[PDB]
Amino acid sequence: LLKLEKELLKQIKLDPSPQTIYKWIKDNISPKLHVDKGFVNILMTSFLQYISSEVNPPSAPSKEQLEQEKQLLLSFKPVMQKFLHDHVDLQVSALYALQVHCYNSNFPKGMLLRFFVHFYDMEIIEEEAFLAWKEDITQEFPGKGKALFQVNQWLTWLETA
């Protein structure tokens, strides 16, 4: 799975067509793993790494980077939905992936919450998963406090009115 992750990210860089990457998964990863939380973790982690590498390469995002990022995420949305729809616990896994990804970049200003807004508006992550992620004690990935600090007002609104 740490391996699998190696291969998947290599494959995305080689050809980031949503179609190609979905076919590679289906042809190279047993379907029993498609509903595994660790697989959803490596999947979402690889997509986010790729998007970052594209939007903010080694050259405070510009409006052009914000649009580019939305567009790339939009092209991946049907692949992510194919594995996450109807699976709230795997959606919580995808939120931990995005938490750890932002933790790994030192929480860039607004990044985590801009992605929560995306994932919610794109119907990738349901309300229930956002609140399960908030309230979850059982998992231990780093960066959970600083993540909460940045999306708490948003989550509280979601929860109450």
DSSP string, the chain: -HHHHHHHHHHHHH---HHHHHHHHHHHS-GGGGG-HHHHHHHHHHHHHHHHHHHS------HHHHHHHHHHHHHHHHHHHHHHTT-HHHHHHHHHHHHHHHHHTT--TTHHHHHHHHHHHTTSS-HHHHHHHHH--S---TTHHHHHHHHHHHHHHHH--
Nearest to 77 by CA among 121, 122, 42, 35: 122
Q: How many CB atoms lie within 10 A of CB 139?
A: 12
Among candidates 123, 127, 124, 125, which has minimal Cα distance to 158? Answer: 127
Q: How many CB atoms sit inside 10 A of residue 148's CB?
A: 14
By the 8 A CB rule, do 104 and 46 touch?
no
Q: How far apart are CA 78 and CA 140, in angstroms?
A: 29
Total number of domains constituting the chain: 1
Burial 24-37, CB ≥16 within 10 A → b, else e: bbeeebeeeebebe
- What range defines the domain where residue 143 resides? 1-161
Q: What tokens were used for 143?
A: 């960066």
Give the count of alpha carbons within 13 A of 61, CB side only. Answer: 18
Instruction: Using CB atoms within 10 Å of the CB of residue 22, give its burial: 0 to 12 exposed, 13 to 18 middle, 19+ buried.
Output: middle
Of the candidates 15, 121, 129, 128, which has an alpha carbon nearest to the alpha carbon of residue 70?
121
The enclosing domain of 65 has a CATH number of 1.25.40.180
Give the technique used to solve this structure: X-ray
**CB-side neighbour CA atoms (13 Å) of 84:** 26
